[PDB]
Amino acid sequence: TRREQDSLGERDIPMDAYFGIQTLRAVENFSLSDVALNHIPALVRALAMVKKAAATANYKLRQLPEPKYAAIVAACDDIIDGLLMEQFVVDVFQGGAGTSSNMNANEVIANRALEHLGRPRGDYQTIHPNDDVNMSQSTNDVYPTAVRLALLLSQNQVQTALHRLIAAFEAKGREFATVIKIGRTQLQDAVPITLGQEFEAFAATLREDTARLEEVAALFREVNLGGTAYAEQAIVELSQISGIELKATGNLVEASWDTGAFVTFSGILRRIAVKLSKIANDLRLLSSGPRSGLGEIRLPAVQPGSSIMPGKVNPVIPESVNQVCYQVIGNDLTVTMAAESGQLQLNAFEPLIVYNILSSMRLLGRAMTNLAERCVDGIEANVERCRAGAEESISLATALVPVVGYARAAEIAKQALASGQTVMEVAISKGLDASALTIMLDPL
Amino acid sequence: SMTRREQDSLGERDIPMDAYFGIQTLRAVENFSLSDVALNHIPALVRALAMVKKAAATANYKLRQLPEPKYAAIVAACDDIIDGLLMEQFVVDVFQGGAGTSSNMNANEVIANRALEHLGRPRGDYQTIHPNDDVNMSQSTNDVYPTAVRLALLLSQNQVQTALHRLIAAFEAKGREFATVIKIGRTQLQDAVPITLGQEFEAFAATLREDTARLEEVAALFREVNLGGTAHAYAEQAIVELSQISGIELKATGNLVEASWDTGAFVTFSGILRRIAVKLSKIANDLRLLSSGPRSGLGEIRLPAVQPGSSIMPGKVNPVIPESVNQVCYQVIGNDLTVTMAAESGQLQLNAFEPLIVYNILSSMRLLGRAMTNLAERCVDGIEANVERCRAGAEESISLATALVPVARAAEIAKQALASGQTVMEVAIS
Amino acid sequence: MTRREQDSLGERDIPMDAYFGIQTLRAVENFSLSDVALNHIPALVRALAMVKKAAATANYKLRQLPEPKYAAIVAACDDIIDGLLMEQFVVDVFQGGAGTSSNMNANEVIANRALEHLGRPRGDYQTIHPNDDVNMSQSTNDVYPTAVRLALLLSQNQVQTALHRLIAAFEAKGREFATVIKIGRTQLQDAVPITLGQEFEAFAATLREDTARLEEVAALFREVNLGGHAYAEQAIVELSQISGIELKATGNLVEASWDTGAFVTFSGILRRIAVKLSKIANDLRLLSSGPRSGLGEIRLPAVQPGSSIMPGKVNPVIPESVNQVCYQVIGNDLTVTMAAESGQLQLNAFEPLIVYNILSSMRLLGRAMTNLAERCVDGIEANVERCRAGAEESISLATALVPVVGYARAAEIAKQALASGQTVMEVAIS
Amino acid sequence: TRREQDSLGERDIPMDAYFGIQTLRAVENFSLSDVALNHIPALVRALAMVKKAAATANYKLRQLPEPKYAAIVAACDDIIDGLLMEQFVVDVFQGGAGTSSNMNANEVIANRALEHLGRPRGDYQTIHPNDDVNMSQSTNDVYPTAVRLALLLSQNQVQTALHRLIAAFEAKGREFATVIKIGRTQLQDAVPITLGQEFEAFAATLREDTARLEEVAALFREVNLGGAYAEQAIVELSQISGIELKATGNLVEASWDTGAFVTFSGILRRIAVKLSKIANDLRLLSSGPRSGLGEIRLPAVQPGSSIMPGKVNPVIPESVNQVCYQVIGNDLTVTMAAESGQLQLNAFEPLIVYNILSSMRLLGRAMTNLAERCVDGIEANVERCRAGAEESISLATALVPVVGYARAAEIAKQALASGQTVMEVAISKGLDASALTIMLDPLR
Ligand SMILES: [Cl-]
Ligand SMILES: [Cl-]
Ligand SMILES: [Cl-]
Ligand SMILES: [Cl-]
């Protein structure tokens, strides 16, 4: 061990560690979940990018000296490129409003930067975690800026998955365009529709979230960096470094506690979860059986069965999706509570908030990808079973009204229900023309 | 048109002459018009408040020399409210701020003015019966209100218990009716092994039986009250009087500084209502699923029709009672979240949000009792089994091959039946 | 006296005078759950009457509905649109049937009022038939979800006005307190100085954002499935003229059939406003705490009386009422989420619960913000001296001395000030 | 790698893996969260105990040959003892209602049993994951039994944490018995109490939870294991786990009941509610040091800035609040899973058990950390506490018998306007202080 010192006193730190005393304290202070900052690596990379922006802004503004600027920029590039992730060890449930994550960055960046200067660990007389790495910065504009960037960095995985699942539902809508089946309202047999229309409707509801997701995420572009001249500078560098176009917030006093964008964005994750769960529930119900459920579609069998129980297909991929959806809805309540609990000039609970949102983005992204790839793409229609449902439709009797009158049609409907026959069968047996029914049964 | 002029610490105001409420209730009416839902929409809380006032008046008469003429006028007024009169005078919004103060004050003024009337004196004659000095003697909001909240919940228990027992009985009787009705069990919505529809309905009963005892045990936490914590002889006596008036044995909290902010019992009780709603909604869901069809769904049961259907669409029975049950359960779950937030938001020596809490829990209690009542009476009691459709499900079971094991080769009969579309009774002859 | 009426289930007696019929009476018995009737959400009743007017006009214009019956029906619709006959809308908001009983409650009331217009008695359904005439060309699954969306559209102005009123109130105080120096607090610890005016402008700013978002999300409700073709296209055009909103037919009926996305998104914007509002109210309760042993930075107008012996005690009742409304709206949002998630195939059966929760939450929030603005924010006063003292006792001020005397020296001045009660300017002046 | 086969086909498995083909399919089917079964080791140990119980009953009933029993039992013992955790790889968000957890155990146990027999992995004709390890078992009795057992095995850690925090608050209630301060109701100065009473109230509310937690956890003791064999398996499982279990009476009810998970999650929620409130109070009482309430000092556990002395961010209570919001969110996740049961099974117990075990761990550590790193070291600002009590306007009431109500109120208003105490005003008008200092006496 090497021995380090901060304002509280002395501790012994593994020489193998790139983190320093303040991080070690945080590890014992907030050991709560065995979930560390490295399990949310987007926040780590965002933290390294903000630090680079700030070193550059200090350098160009003559504030920070030139050998320091350059060793620290190197160090940040190292992390941005995915090195030293295991050095990010503070619990996601950390108190301190982001301070412990800021410090974990500052200290790791300092040590790494020393190691670029051929100097040993803890040599903070050369590169200081606070004095240098943190120069012109405080946690209350750094951490909120890095949270927003982490979410901006994470948008693409969600968008890609959503588009992929939309495409999968679209393809099946085209494949099943000719597959007639019975619509069901309140789970009672309704009027004929196509299975293709049902799948196209899964696509269409989700298509509505793509643009909305993008537009709410754009709210995160408005950042408070340099909120304590230097500010305008750091923001410019952060835009180039991150590859995302950022802008200074119009109101700093408003921004200091504002969690509004976090609430809106979580609310769209929630909205996608609600739709996705309903769709998964439909898939489980449509594939019920194989003999005594609806038996309208077959899902790909992705888990092995028993030779003596063939035809049993547990709809495990939709089940996993349902679970992710319930989790996302609970995590949204978690975010609501943290957001509601802000006080005066700060919300202290952004670490909780960013952990729940990034987690929910991961969960939903993966669930949609799995749902498309390991289920939707391989769904097959039981064409004959779908047709049987539509042809047994009591609603077919309504197409007889023009020709025979309401009362007689209703009497033909009653006779069909009683005798187990199709409306067409009952119409035929009466010496009637059932041509209008044929039209109700035409997907085209 | 006539008014009388009243005064409080904020100033003077004109009050409609015949109103039994006074200046402070009038201010609360102006201040908290938020939902159009007034205190008289939760009459249990109004009755409970009147019980508390009566208990306090009796203790003041016994121990603190409240004059007999005031005492008897005041008690007569509380009795009237307890018995359902003057409910329309309880006009403050259930969303009122003030942690219950405006509810206390609505009671104080109405009781004062109704007492005055019993003494043949005019409204507003507060030198004779004073809302604060007489009706509120020895009390403050901070012991009167939480005590009245606890009492209101206790007085409302029996309506939920009765309904739960009614629904349980309904389910038990169909479990007997359906004991010989064989059908296919379904797991993860896949055809599984045969069960009876009787067993299915008895399981709906069984899960609800677990709730009756838990409900009484949690409700009994409400018996510990902080009444008289404002003013120990007075306290002890007011509680003895309140137990007598209410017919429920109550006790003093042993720790008043703890009792001051404590909402634990509310959260636990809201929690059991929530648990009951989760089970009931699942059961409603099952009923809607089992009655799907009549041709292209499950079609295993038929629910009684309670609203007319279309003559051209015979057989269609929308499961409207279970649907109304689902909506009530989603309301209760949401209300439980409202309670959780109010509860978590207490500060130091008070939770300011008990008006919201008591409003939500009483509402949820009424909603649940009536949903369970309606489910039993307007749905469960008339449920029919489509016995031959149930049978065909069970006889179509591939699980039946497993029985054949004394003949592996059984797996080949199962494979043949699946693809052939025939039963495992049909394939095994051959 | 009662009149006798009949439907497909049988006969019932109806109060002679009632404008509702047998179908509505059945619904009263079937769904008696909450004691909250359709008349408690009058925007839905008005919207139903608009949809019934538009359908009658379409039907008339296409030769399906005779002139005298059309004209009497439209006049009956107009009466209800004005608020007449609200008391005849008696069906519980927790009704099952996905909106059927609401549709029928309208059909029967409009039939009987049109019959009155033609000088006929109640129940003369031979002249005007609730189903055949008033519900001509219509079904629940198009009429009700259309009327839900329209009710939501007609209810926008109230929330928008409330929100603008509140923003205006905070903006005014932001200017008035523009020079009131005070101490910022982060994590509840003394931070760096700010102005009280900035604190209030920020409340305005955060709520300004919600205004455009509210309008944007509300536009989504214009896509309706009414009439799901000569009839369909005519009905929407008539409904757009009647309602003064430009409505568009949905392009995907199979998708529209179960879609609740817009309800969830709307409820979500109410939830966000509530989150923000509650935080603001909590801020107001904290800043006005005391008056001597709290923060004491501002005084809320006293709106509810106190005891003259306890002066300076101002319970923050308006913000408290606001917190309660916010907690309710968040719970109601969970209720909407559960209902939206529980859609099945070609219908969501739970729109009656969704529309009730969203309309209630809108009314509560609108009233909460109007009250917060008028009865609290407008009268707020700064304690200028107590504010300045907090800013004067800020240890953070020592940071401005770093360039003057260097770190170590500035930090010992900081340290000396802490350990000695005195301010940074006091210790530096020595 | 080695090649295995199941009823769907063949996969190659890394040669050093103890899991088999069915687990490998599960990793592919349900990669969603990057959180594997090994992050909830109590369920791993429960499953191993259930498998040990089943092998032993099977053996004693002469259905499982001696050498297979001995090897299986040895393998289960290794897992109960904490070996092979890393082989439990299936995502917590797995579909299949538990199947993949059951199969993960069956495969790992079979292979480890093979190692005890000196046989290679994959030799399933010697020890078969399904025919031998899963003999007389199905997912739908084994999984929900293991879930109930996991929650029972995790009770002690939460009870220990709760008792620790109660004891920390009790000791401070004793320490602060003579510290008078001003009560606050609706955030307004009310009447004096003691700081000691305030801390004893924190203890007292949490004490009500200890007994109820146990009585609710007792509900998990009723298991559906086996539903002769069944009774015997439960007797064994009780012995193996050291927790007394009993067979459920109704198997058709038990098949879908999630009643106990909802009640238990509700007690975790109730605890979170009380704990967050308490943490809110600690953060408020320690606000300042100068322009807050400044009544107590929390231990400084996070390094400060030398030029901001006096700033003590309440980081431990803040981490507690975050945990409490997570627990409330998780509780909603459980409610949705529980409500979404259908017919003879609830498909979502994997999600339920994960949320509940995570919530148990979070709360247990939060409460431990609050006691040890915060409450034990809290100190009173005795003088500031006393000043708050002495400036209480309520004091004017004690003068009513001396000067009458009216004159008492004039002094109250004057105190308020001058900023003086009621005693200072009283003395200034030549009135006796006697009555006042009685209402400021900690003995009441
Ligand atoms: Cl991440
Ligand atoms: Cl009530
Ligand atoms: Cl309305
Ligand atoms: Cl665990």
TrEMBL record, chain A:
Highest taxon listed in the record's lineage: Bacteria
Q: For this protein, what is any one GO molecular function term?
A: aspartate ammonia-lyase activity
Q: Which UniProt keywords apply?
A: Lyase
List residues of the Fumarase C C-terminal domain.
396-444
Principal EC category: lyase
GO BP annotation list? aspartate metabolic process; tricarboxylic acid cycle
Q: Which PANTHER family has this protein been placed in?
A: ASPARTATE AMMONIA-LYASE (PTHR42696)
**Can you name this protein?**
Fumarate lyase:Delta crystallin
Automatic annotation (TrEMBL), chain D:
UniProt keywords (A-Z) are: Lyase
Q: Which domain of life is it from?
A: Bacteria
Kindly give the Gene3D superfamilies that the UniProt entry links to this protein.
Fumarase/aspartase (C-terminal domain), Fumarase/aspartase (Central domain), Fumarase/aspartase (N-terminal domain)
Q: Give the Gene Ontology MF terms in alphabetical order.
A: aspartate ammonia-lyase activity
Q: What is its EC number?
A: 4.3.1.1
First-level EC class: lyase
One Pfam family, please name it: Lyase_1
Cellular component (GO) terms are: cytosol
Extract the coiled-coil ranges from the record. none
Task: Report the leader peptide range.
Answer: none
Q: Which SUPFAM superfamilies match?
A: L-aspartase-like
What Gene Ontology biological process does one annotation of this record name? tricarboxylic acid cycle
Which residue intervals define the domain Fumarate lyase N-terminal in the entry?
9-329
Tell me yes or no: is Lyase among this UniProt entry's keywords.
yes
What InterPro entries does the record tag this protein with?
Answer: Aspartate_Ammonia-Lyase, Fumarase/histidase_N, Fumarase_C_C, Fumarate_lyase_CS, Fumarate_lyase_fam, Fumarate_lyase_N, L-Aspartase-like
Occurrences of domain Fumarase C C-terminal (ranges): 395-444
Q: What is this protein called?
A: Fumarate lyase:Delta crystallin
Question: Which source organism does the UniProt entry give?
Answer: Brucella abortus (strain 2308)
Which gene produces this protein? Answer: aspA
